[PDB]
Design a protein around this ligand. Structure first.
Ligand code: NDP
Ligand code: XCF
Length: 158
């Protein structure tokens, strides 16, 4: 499978100043669940944001930089390289990757953050005319997760 994995808010903000605008442990545990044992593909800036590879899965960074060679990370240098990765591949960010891949992926795992944040990076617009809701699960609120949020699994129609 080729999947998108993304959290975006009511206006499709994904980012601010190279960070997530929200603090939401549950969603990061969501990410852990989904992608552990599989492969994440991410652009260089996103990799730089996270700082190092995520444990217990394959980390692939897409970059133009041929100097790039990082302990625990596989480098690719074209979009086309994605399609030769074995396994369940998650497109993991950021704006540029999402824009490039959204028409290409089988399905999307979206966490809708039910707020409006200040952002400088965005998920591309999409229509539910194009995308079937395989599931929609309200995330649980509590002391440490205080933003309402919904896990969507969408699958391309037709
Ligand atoms: N909310 C969420 O689920 C997520 C949000 N984010 C947010 O997104 C923002 C980052 O997005 P964005 O600025 O687009 O950066 P990206 O993470 O998408 O990285 C951009 C870089 O990726 C490399 N790249 C992209 N496409 C190609 C290509 N076709 N060929 C070769 N290299 C390529 C380039 O690296 P280079 O210049 O080195 O060649 C490019 O500069 C951050 O604010 C982050 O917080 C990130 C992940 C998830
Ligand atoms: C841009 O910043 C992040 C993007 C992301 C990417 C990301 C976050 N959330 C969702 N739902 N999808 C995504 N693709 C993450 C993230 C980020 O900040 C650390 O944190 C954690 C990593 C283990 C430390 C996980 C994801």
């Amino acid at each position: 499978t080729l999947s998108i994995l993304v959290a975006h808010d009511l206006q499709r903000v994904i980012g601010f100043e190279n960070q997530l605008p929200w603090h939401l442990p549950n969603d990061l545990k969501h990410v852990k669940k989904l992608s552990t044992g599989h492969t994440l593909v991410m652009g260089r800036k996103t990799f730089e944001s996270i700082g190092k590879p995520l444990p217990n899965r394959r980390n692939v960074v897409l970059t133009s930089d041929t100097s790039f060679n990082v302990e625990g990370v596989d480098v690719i240098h074209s979009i086309e390289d994605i399609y030769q990765l074995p396994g369940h591949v998650f497109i993991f960010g950021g704006q540029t990757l999402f824009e490039e891949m959204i028409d290409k992926v089988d399905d999307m795992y979206i966490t809708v953050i039910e707020g409006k944040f200040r952002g400088d990076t965005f998920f591309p617009p999409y229509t539910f005319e194009d995308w079937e809701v395989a599931s929609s699960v309200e995330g649980k609120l509590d002391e440490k997760n205080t933003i309402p949020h919904t896990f969507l699994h969408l699958i391309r129609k037709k």
